[PDB]
Design a protein around this nucleic acid. Structure first.
Ligand SMILES: [Mg+2]
Ligand SMILES: [Mg+2]
Ligand SMILES: [Mg+2]
Ligand SMILES: [Mg+2]
Ligand SMILES: [Mg+2]
Ligand SMILES: [Mg+2]
Ligand SMILES: [Mg+2]
Ligand SMILES: [Mg+2]
Ligand SMILES: [Mg+2]
Ligand SMILES: [Mg+2]
Ligand SMILES: [Mg+2]
Ligand SMILES: [Mg+2]
Ligand SMILES: [Mg+2]
Ligand SMILES: [Mg+2]
Ligand SMILES: [Mg+2]
Ligand SMILES: [Mg+2]
Ligand SMILES: [Mg+2]
Ligand SMILES: [Mg+2]
Ligand SMILES: [Mg+2]
Ligand SMILES: [Mg+2]
Ligand SMILES: [Mg+2]
Ligand SMILES: [Mg+2]
Ligand SMILES: [Mg+2]
Ligand SMILES: [Mg+2]
Ligand SMILES: [Mg+2]
Ligand SMILES: [Mg+2]
Ligand SMILES: [Mg+2]
Ligand SMILES: [Mg+2]
Ligand SMILES: [Mg+2]
Ligand SMILES: [Mg+2]
Ligand SMILES: [Zn+2]
Lengths: 75, 159, 104, 213
RNA sequence: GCGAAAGACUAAUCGAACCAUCUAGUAGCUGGUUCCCUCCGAAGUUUCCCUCAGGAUAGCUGGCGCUCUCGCACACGCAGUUUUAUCCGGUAAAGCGAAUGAUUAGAGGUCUUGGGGCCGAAACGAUCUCAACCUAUUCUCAAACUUUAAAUGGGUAAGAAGCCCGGCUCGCUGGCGUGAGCCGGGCGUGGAAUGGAGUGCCUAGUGGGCCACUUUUGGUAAGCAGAACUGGCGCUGCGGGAUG
RNA sequence: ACAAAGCAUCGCGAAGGCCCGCGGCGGGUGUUGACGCGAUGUGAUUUCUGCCCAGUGCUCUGAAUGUCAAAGUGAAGAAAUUCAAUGAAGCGCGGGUAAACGGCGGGAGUAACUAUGACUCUCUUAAGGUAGCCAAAUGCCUCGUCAUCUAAUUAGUGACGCG
RNA sequence: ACAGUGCCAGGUGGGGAGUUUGACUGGGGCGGUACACCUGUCAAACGGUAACGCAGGUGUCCUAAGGCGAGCUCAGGGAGGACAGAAACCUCCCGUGGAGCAGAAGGGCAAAAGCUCGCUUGAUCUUGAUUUUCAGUACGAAUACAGACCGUGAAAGCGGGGCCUCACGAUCCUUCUGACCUUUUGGGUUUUAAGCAGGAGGUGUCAGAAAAGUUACCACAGGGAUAACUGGCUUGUGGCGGCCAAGCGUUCAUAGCGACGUCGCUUUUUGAUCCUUCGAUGUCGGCUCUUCCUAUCAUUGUGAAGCAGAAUUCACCAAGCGUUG
RNA sequence: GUCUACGGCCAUACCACCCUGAACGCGCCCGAUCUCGUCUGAUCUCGGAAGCUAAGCAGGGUCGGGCCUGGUUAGUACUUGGAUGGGAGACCGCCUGGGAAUACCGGGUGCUGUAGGCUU
RNA sequence: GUUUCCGUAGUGUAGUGGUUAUCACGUUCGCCUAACACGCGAAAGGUCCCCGGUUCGAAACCGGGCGGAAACACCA
């Protein structure tokens, strides 16, 4: 009652017919896997961002009016 | 049927090459890795802690972690069809900066530079690479010789 | 193998290492008004034959020894279990083997 | 005794050297891969006559024996006992196998047929590639014919097919015969019993100082 | 039940009757399975199995679909492709005067030492001889060797998720910075060739396969046994290969 | 082949042996009584019935300090309880029994041809195959060896016998 | 006052019942374990790959045989040095690694991972992520991080067992520990019991059946996926035949022979194999009767001989008719 | 040029031997009051500074071993695809691409990183 | 062929866990005996089959072998 004990025969044919998809990689992949002491921290970075938006907005408008003046001084 | 053990068939991979049996040159763990950087795995005998394993000895992947003496690294591994982008935790010793990317970067730095310049001209410069064209009509010249006559040489049995 | 009788290590309740007293564990006497048994008895009672399993097919020749640590400092006394690899010969504080000595 | 050479004529398998891995090897039939005046000199004995295989095959140890002997017999006659060297250059050495004869008694009842098919050591054989030398001989330049035919008889203990060829070297060296008398007289080459040392313009000068002295 | 005993006999019935019912008993096992046409269209491959005649799940298939692109002078993507970079790789070959392992031969050496001689009481005394070692050599080899070391092969990469400016946050890290995260602005075809791309359910059959080139393991050899790689047949005719 | 007659064991004095039945104060032997009933073994006649109770059985006014339930009695407790001592038969020990199942062995030297060996070493075991018998319906090696019967015999008979 | 019957308990009970009595497996039965793992190889240079392919190991042991930390240098050889000799003891020199590193190998290792000592418990408690076996499920084993509490070290670090690859195991069951934990229920208190979370008992067929035989008295489903004939292939063995040629043959190779070697056929020997057949092709011999082959024992015609005759072997055409009681 | 301190890549650096050291250091050296360590101040620690380049080291040398390149062997060996090529078979031939290794010949012999000297 | 079992003094045979080797017999020497037996006192004798490995060390523990033994080789 003996038989075959493997083969990897047509096969190439199969796990290949539908393709072999090189894994569709998004931007913005998961941070799960990373050392907790990164995340522990970068969440205090991410959480206390808005504290410091007043600077951010004014300091934007400074650069925006300085570059409205740079492009207008070119004109 | 064979043994599954993690380090079968590694007798002669992980084996350090020649006359390098010993102190791991220190440079190889004082160059900086950081997430995004592409890295070639290359297993090593000397240090066994934080080894990769043969099914990715000699692959490349990007780095996604950096721990105190290891680098979490995402590599693609083929497995009866479906390739799996998958993540391992390999100690620095077994890793390098692949220069794979580093033709491009030097090609970028050149193209942005050659585009910003020749914009004040407006002349269109050949930015893309292009495969090796057919070799152009040239001439040759002999001067004061005819060429040398070859004859196939008569066989005699050497031993 | 061998192990010593004392053993400074983590006492859960203290939140600290402390000296523990090592001694190996033996099984309890088996309860009889434990649910499992109560049910094994009186399924297997009445005019029925044997119901539940019993091996006649051992294999290994050795059990994982278990140390029964307990905290020396009083009021802790919080005993904790610490399993160990297998050995077919196990001792507590039986000498320190020596080095460089004559083997008579 | 053994199956006829036929069945182990051809190299199918990877070399089985007698080693740790196989053991209980019966000692190789052949034992002397040179005879005659192996006490000769290079300078008195100038004719590297050769026997060369033309086929990728295996040669039994017991063929090599015969092949040798029948060349010791014809040379002797021919040249005399002192007047040659013969060298065999294939010491049999990958080991050949035999399933253990499918032994059974009378009508029999059980052989098990194929289980544990792997045999035992039977003997020993040489690997031989094409254009590769098997036997070589040296004599006097005089006595060419008497080499030719000695190897000629040896071909007939010996399967497949194989040419007899006369070399361009001093006897048993690698140094092309048109060239010794010169290369010795100036000492690129220095006599060393059978063979000869090539001495180059390399080592310390006091090595030279000994020659041309 | 009955047997002077032979598993004899119990009404053509006996290793233990016949009749009815439970009764559609159960069956991984034989056999069969009923109208047309159109389209796509296998597997005998994966791991667990009281598993080897079967199941479990890997596959491959169909159907059902959906998200979009745009061939509507005005496309990104993907890929049994190929280049250019770049790693990875230990097979063929080779070598073995590079390690290990075998092994021939001579020159050489009281190396050592020996054990026999022969000439010596005996004497590295003479001369032989053979052991072993080793100094230059040479013959020939290794699947469980390797200094070298291909061909064929396997990763990446060849940009908009990309460069380049500005600025903020942090409990991590540090003499300061890093590092990471964010906001804000500045900047486009980035080797060839091909073709519209994406992703979600149900899910049958199948899970005995066989053959060829080349590679290759058993075997002596087979139409023998077992792998690789590819190619077939199964599953599918036809011209040829007289036949197959 | 079975039976058979003959030989042999074995239980049984009826609140019994053996036995039936589902059950009764049920039934067969049994309208019986050991010269009977039941249970076996071998197989007329003649001659004989060798050793072994080391195993397993069987069995025995045999100790049962071996253990051992129920109940029974001891105790703590608040109770389920829990923990004590004691303890049948069979189980553990000791005898008997083989016309119960059965079993019944290897090694050297040593004699005046050679050989062989009356003799004398070991060792083991529960005894260690005795009288016979044997190439038998038991013998692998096997056309055992010798005799006879045949012109010729793997056939037959007669001997031999480490069987 | 037991006999006796009622009913529990323990023994004894193929007298009787039901049941089981692995798989792998050149058929099977008896041989092994290829039933879980681990080295070297096959294995065709990313990974993977079989057979009862090879060549081997494992079910281990360690209070340290780990963690640090320190300290030194290993096998072997030479030259020296009382007794002392191929080996005790010492000292110099050489000593890439020939030692050593609990074990199979395999990889790894030197002011180390080799050796010696001091200090000890990082073999400790705790979430998560990943690798490996992959379905990419478990277990086992590993890798990286993080949080406690600690050893060591001037310190950097290093250390969650044992330089890396094996060295162990579900459900249900049992036990021990842990928390002023939850339930124990119409309330409450104590026992008791059930949870919850960690450890142990264990399935050796290693993802985990509580299990002896025999059937020639046998049965049913099946089976050419499994044997015993026939047939194919194969040809080891058998038989037959060449070549080379050392010899024998008084001498002389080859009249006749012919070693050590070597090249073939043949299918009248046995093996392998398992292609056909298991809705079964009658299974050994004997008789009779045909026909064919030649692998010529006779006879016809021939060539050989070491052929004088006589007698005899070698060979050719040759299968014409012979091969008996 | 050169050295020291710390270094990178780890022999073009190693090894074997030969030659020369101006200054500063680098060394050799001298001793054990303390620290510290030993059987021994043999090594380590420490306090020094009476000598000399004796060696290291440094600097140089060798038709020197070695290592590192080149060549050669060699378009050889081997190989991707290829054919209704040859060959009884082993094997061999060609077509399309790729293409090693030894012996044998050559050349070279460590480059520099920061901090600090000296030759003012 | 496959599965077992042995091998130790001149011979038959003990023995241990890894430090050590026995018994009986045999034999050599005395004594007793007129002389042999018997009896009594003294004595010497193997690489623990050949190996490689482990180990402080092996007769004894692995692996290989060599010699002597036993046991299976069932359906056709
Ligand atoms: Mg009951
Ligand atoms: Mg019967
Ligand atoms: Mg390999
Ligand atoms: Mg087949
Ligand atoms: Mg009887
Ligand atoms: Mg009797
Ligand atoms: Mg008895
Ligand atoms: Mg008798
Ligand atoms: Mg008779
Ligand atoms: Mg008759
Ligand atoms: Mg029964
Ligand atoms: Mg079976
Ligand atoms: Mg491969
Ligand atoms: Mg250290
Ligand atoms: Mg921690
Ligand atoms: Mg260690
Ligand atoms: Mg209640
Ligand atoms: Mg109440
Ligand atoms: Mg019968
Ligand atoms: Mg078949
Ligand atoms: Mg079929
Ligand atoms: Mg047949
Ligand atoms: Mg003659
Ligand atoms: Mg019929
Ligand atoms: Mg003829
Ligand atoms: Mg001093
Ligand atoms: Mg100096
Ligand atoms: Mg000097
Ligand atoms: Mg040189
Ligand atoms: Mg074609
Ligand atoms: Zn505590």
């Amino acid at each position: 009652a003996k038989s075959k004990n493997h083969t990897t025969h047509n096969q190439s044919r199969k796990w290949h017919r539908n393709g072999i998809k090189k894994p569709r990689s998004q931007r913005y992949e998961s941070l799960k896997g990373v050392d907790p002491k990164f995340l522990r921290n970068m969440r205090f970075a991410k959480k206390h961002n808005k504290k410091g938006l007043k600077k951010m907005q004014a300091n934007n408008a400074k650069a925006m009016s300085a570059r409205a003046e740079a492009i207008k001084a070119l004109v | 049927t064979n043994t599954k053990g993690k380090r079968r068939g590694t007798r002669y991979m992980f084996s350090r090459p020649f006359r390098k049996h010993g102190v791991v040159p220190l440079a190889t763990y004082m160059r900086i890795y950081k997430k995004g950087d592409i890295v070639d795995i290359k297993g090593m005998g000397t240090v066994q802690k934080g080894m990769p394993h043969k099914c990715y000895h000699g692959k490349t992947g990007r780095v996604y972690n950096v721990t105190q003496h290891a680098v979490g690294i995402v590599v693609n591994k083929q497995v009866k069809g479906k390739i799996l982008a998958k993540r391992i935790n390999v100690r620095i010793e077994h890793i390098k900066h692949s220069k794979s990317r580093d033709s491009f970067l030097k090609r970028v730095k050149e193209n942005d530079q050659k585009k910003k310049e020749a914009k004040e001209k407006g002349t269109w410069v050949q930015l893309k690479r292009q495969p090796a064209p057919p070799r152009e009509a040239h001439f040759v010249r002999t001067n004061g010789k005819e060429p040398e006559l070859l004859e196939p040489i008569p066989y005699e049995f050497m031993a | 193998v061998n192990v010593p009788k004392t053993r400074r290590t983590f006492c859960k309740k203290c939140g600290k290492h402390q000296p523990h007293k090592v001694t190996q564990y033996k099984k309890g006497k088996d309860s009889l008004y434990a649910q499992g048994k109560r049910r094994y008895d009186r399924k297997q009672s009445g005019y029925g034959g044997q119901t539940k399993p019993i091996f006649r097919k051992k294999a290994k020749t050795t059990k994982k020894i278990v140390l029964r640590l307990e905290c020396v400092e009083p009021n802790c006394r919080s005993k904790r279990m610490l399993a160990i690899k297998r050995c077919k010969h196990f001792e507590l504080g039986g000498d320190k083997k020596r080095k460089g000595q004559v083997i008579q | 005794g053994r199956r006829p050479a036929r069945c182990y004529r051809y190299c199918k398998n990877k070399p089985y050297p007698k080693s740790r891995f196989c053991r209980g090897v019966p000692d190789a039939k052949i034992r002397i891969f040179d005879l005659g005046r192996k006490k000769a000199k290079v300078d008195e004995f100038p004719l590297g006559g050769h026997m060369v295989s033309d086929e990728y095959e295996q040669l039994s140890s017991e063929a090599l024996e015969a092949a040798r002997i029948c060349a010791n017999k014809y040379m002797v006659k021919s040249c005399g006992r002192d007047g040659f060297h013969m060298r065999v250059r294939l010491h049999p050495f990958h080991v050949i196998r035999i399933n253990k004869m499918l032994s059974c008694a009378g009508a029999d009842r059980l052989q098990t047929g194929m289980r544990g098919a792997f045999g035992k050591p039977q003997g020993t054989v040489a690997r031989v590639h094409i254009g590769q030398v098997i036997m070589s001989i040296r004599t006097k330049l005089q006595n060419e014919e008497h080499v030719i035919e000695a190897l000629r008889r040896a071909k007939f203990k010996f399967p497949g097919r194989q040419k007899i060829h006369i070399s361009k070297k001093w006897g048993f060296t690698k140094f092309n015969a048109d060239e010794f008398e010169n290369m010795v007289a100036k000492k690129c080459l220095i006599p060393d019993g059978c063979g000869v040392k090539y001495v180059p313009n390399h080592g310390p000068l006091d090595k030279w100082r000994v020659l041309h002295s």
